[PDB]
Amino acid sequence: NPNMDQFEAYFKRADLDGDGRISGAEAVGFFQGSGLSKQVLAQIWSLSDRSHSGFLDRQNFYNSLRLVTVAQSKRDLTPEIVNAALNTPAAAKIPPPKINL
Ligand SMILES: [Ca+2]
Ligand code: NA
């Protein structure tokens, strides 16, 4: 499957209970494979849980994956970078991240 959807594959791996949402605990466990600091992952979680419900839907989780890629590229998150990933078609250019599984 050379064109396999890696965002979807990560969503399915992260969603341990199959309820179609990524819970806080599921995100903590999944992103332990990201190589990022807990401070950065906290900021990504906050930015991604747009409804403040404690769960990420698919869109929210894919956006958290995009922010993880930017952080793995050693770019400092700025308000402009965050908005570019969350609210503009620049998001489509961001690869899925590398996650140790
Ligand atoms: Ca879940
Ligand atoms: Na939410």
Residue numbers in the entry: 5 to 105
What text does the study give?
In contrast to animals and yeasts, CME in plants depends on the TPLATE complex (TPC), an evolutionary ancient adaptor complex. In this study, we used a multidisciplinary approach to elucidate the structural and functional roles of the evolutionary conserved N-terminal Eps15 homology (EH) domains of the TPC subunit AtEH1/Pan1.
EH1.1 consists of two EF-hands connected by two short antiparallel β-sheets. Anomalous scattering supports a calcium ion bound in a pentagonal-bipyramidal geometry in the loop of the first EF-hand. With respect to EH1.1, the NMR and X-ray structures agree very well with a RMSD of 1 Å. The major difference between the two domains is at the interaction interface of the N- and C-terminal ends. The hydrophobic core of EH1.1 is shielded by the proline-rich C-terminal loop, while in EH1.2, the proline-rich N-terminal loop takes over this function. On the one hand, EH1.1 coordinates the PA molecules by three main regions (residues around K42, residues around K78, and residues located at the C-terminus around K97). The N-terminal double NPF peptide of SCAMP5 was identified as a significant interactor of EH1.1. Bio-Layer Interferometry (BLI) confirmed the interaction between EH1.1 and a peptide derived from the N-terminus of SCAMP5 with a binding affinity (Kd) of 59 µM via steady-state kinetics. We conclude that the N-terminal double NPF motif of SCAMP5 interacts preferentially with EH1.1, mediated via a hydrophobic interaction with the conserved tryptophan residue.
